[PDB]
């Protein structure tokens, strides 16, 4: 019949956060999967999915843009954010199911592949070993550990690594994340302490990385334009692949970029061409980060094409489980204007148990798989062996 028979959500432990999944079944017995997230400031996604999936049962699995168009109508007043995340999760499960029904990898739905491998950067490096050492080891607790982590990235043939903001000289090594209320300092002022610790951290990272490995810096939402300018001035003489700055002020981000000696990336939290547009119109970014897990991969192709017309290259936002990596891998395979792909190389001790297939890396690149669908399936029995905790992520 090609009809959708069921849409369910599943959830499992990912240590300091949970992973979530959409499981969509068709009348032919094909199962389409996606992975989504609530911990990154996004309570409510499951509720959105459970409501929207009710309307989808009985509809054609093949008609994903019809579903999107309908869903957009039904939730139009509160579009974006958690609503749009729910829509994107369902879209990604629909794509998997459609690809599987047609016996093709998902990139065959997205224009075909135009590359077989994708260069990555090792993200949250050494952020995961510093911030979640119970889950990702060896723990990093000092500048020597920072250096050693970069040395490890170099030895393992990774070509780039991305860090965040860390305070080294005020007690135990800790992250500086005031944009997410750790600590609660909602003005997000940047003081000397922040600047000298950024410098110390990056110098240690460069010492370990050597001169060839690229270093990316993510500042998230942790300052105002004033403070971002202060950081960029301070770090004017560093060799940075990009400095990543999230902002809801296209004019402010454009001002910062205009005064930056480094490439600026942004946009990981934005939805649709509509939200990217003011940033591109303002010349606000060198690189547009696109969250295809949030937007849905079909919607993300639209965003990539929009960026292409502005001669802006895109990078997937990818810092979740293996299924998200494979979803992003398919997007990265199809998009011409691809900057690089993000991936976390630090993995949970049970990550591989949760999925049928793991991403394969060789010489600093992700190999794009050629199996029907995204390239990996969550394993239901494994999910049940790792029951979820209450919401973590930013809401820990």
Summarize the annotated binding site for Mg(2+) as residue ranges: 77, 218, 244, 248, 268-269, 275
209-238: which residues touch Mg ion (CB under 5 A)? 218
258-277: which residues touch a second copy (CB under 8 A)? 258, 261, 263, 268-269, 272-274, 277
Report the residue from 86, 126, 359, 364 that binds a second copy according to the rule CB under 8 A: 86
Give 212-261 as a 3 state SS string.
Answer: CCEEEEECCCCCCHHHHHHHHHHCCCCCCCEEECCCCCHHHHHHHHHCCC
Nearer of residues 107 and 136 to a second copy, judged by Cβ: 107
319-378: which residues touch a second copy (CB under 8 A)? 334, 336-340
CB of residue 188 vs a second copy: minimum separation in angstroms? 8
Report the residue from 80, 139, 278, 393 that binds Mg ion according to the rule CB under 5 A: 80
In angstroms, rounded to a whole number, what is the distance separating the alpha carbons of residues 124 and 141? Answer: 15
Do 122 and 343 meet the contact criterion of CB atoms below 8 Å apart? yes
> According to the binding rule CB under 5 A, does residue 1 interact with Cl ion?
no
Report the residue from 56, 83, 198, 204 that binds a second copy according to the rule CB under 8 A: 83
Selection from a second copy, Cl ion, Mg ion, none that 272 binds (CB < 5 to 8 A by kind) is a second copy
CB of residue 335 vs Cl ion: minimum separation in angstroms? 9
Report the residue from 154, 255, 351, 382 that binds a second copy according to the rule CB under 8 A: 255
Report the residue from 89, 109, 354, 383 that binds a second copy according to the rule CB under 8 A: 109
Indicate the pairing of strand 365-367 with strand 117-122.
Answer: antiparallel
34-53: which residues touch a second copy (CB under 8 A)? 40-48, 50-52
Phi, psi for 372 (deg, rounded to 5): -60, 140
Q: Which two tokens stand for residue 183?
A: 């600590």
In angstroms, rounded to a whole number, what is the distance separating the alpha carbons of residues 90 and 7? Answer: 8
Do 90 and 24 meet the contact criterion of CB atoms below 8 Å apart? yes
Do 316 and 342 meet the contact criterion of CB atoms below 8 Å apart? yes
> According to the binding rule CB under 8 A, does residue 164 interact with a second copy?
no
In angstroms, rounded to a whole number, what is the distance separating the alpha carbons of residues 366 and 369? Answer: 9
Do 292 and 37 meet the contact criterion of CB atoms below 8 Å apart? no
Q: How many CB atoms lie within 10 A of CB 192?
A: 9
Report the residue from 81, 139, 372, 392 that binds a second copy according to the rule CB under 8 A: 81
DSSP, collapsed to helix, strand or coil, labels residue 97 as helix
CB of residue 97 vs a second copy: minimum separation in angstroms? 12
Q: Which two tokens stand for residue 244?
A: 């990543």
> According to the binding rule CB under 5 A, does residue 227 interact with Cl ion?
no
CB of residue 269 vs Mg ion: minimum separation in angstroms? 8
Nearer of residues 225 and 393 to Cl ion, judged by Cβ: 393
Give the binding site for Mg ion (CB under 5 A): 80, 218, 244, 268
Give the binding site for Cl ion (CB under 5 A): 17-18, 39, 185, 187, 391-393
């Amino acid at each position: 019949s090609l009809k959708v028979v069921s849409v369910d959500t599943l959830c499992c432990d990912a240590g300091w956060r949970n992973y979530h999944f959409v499981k969509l079944t068709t009348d032919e017995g094909i199962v389409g999967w996606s992975e989504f997230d609530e911990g990154f400031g996004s309570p409510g996604v499951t509720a959105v999915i459970e409501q929207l999936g009710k309307r989808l049962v009985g509809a054609s699995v093949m008609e994903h843009e019809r579903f999107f168009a309908e869903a957009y109508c039904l939730t139009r007043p509160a579009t974006g954010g958690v609503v749009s995340e729910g829509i994107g999760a369902i879209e990604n499960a629909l794509l998997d199911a459609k690809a599987k029904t047609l016996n093709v990898p998902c990139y065959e739905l997205l224009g075909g592949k135009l590359r077989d491998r994708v260069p990555v950067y090792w993200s949250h490096c050494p952020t995961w070993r510093i911030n979640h050492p119970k889950f990702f080891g060896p723990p990093v607790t000092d500048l020597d550990g920072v250096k050693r982590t970069a040395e490890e990235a170099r030895e393992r043939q990774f070509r780039a690594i991305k860090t965040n903001i860390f305070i080294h000289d005020d007690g135990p090594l800790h992250a500086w994340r005031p944009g997410f209320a750790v600590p609660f300092q909602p003005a997000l002022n940047v003081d000397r302490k922040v600047l000298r610790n950024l410098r110390a951290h990056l110098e240690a990272l460069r010492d370990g990385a050597g001169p060839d490995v690229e270093i990316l810096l993510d500042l998230n939402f942790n300052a105002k334009p004033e403070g971002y300018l202060k950081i960029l001035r301070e770090l004017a003489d560093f060799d940075l692949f990009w400095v990543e700055i999230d902002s809801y002020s296209p004019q402010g981000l454009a001002y910062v970029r205009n005064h930056s000696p480094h490439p600026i990336s942004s946009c990981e939290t934005l939805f649709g061409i509509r939200e990217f547009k003011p940033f591109f119109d303002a010349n606000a970014v060198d690189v547009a980060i696109v969250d295809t897990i949030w937007n849905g991969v079909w919607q993300s192709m639209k965003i990539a094409a929009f960026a292409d017309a502005h001669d802006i290259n895109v990078a997937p936002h990818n810092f979740y489980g293996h299924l998200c990596t494979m979803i992003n891998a398919n997007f990265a395979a199809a998009v011409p204007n691809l900057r690089i792909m993000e991936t976390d190389i630090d993995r949970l001790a049970w990550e591989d148990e949760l999925f049928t297939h793991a991403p394969e890396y060789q010489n600093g690149e992700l190999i794009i798989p050629d199996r029907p669908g995204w390239g990996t399936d969550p394993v239901e029995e494994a999910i049940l062996a790792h029951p979820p905790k209450v919401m973590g992520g930013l809401l820990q």
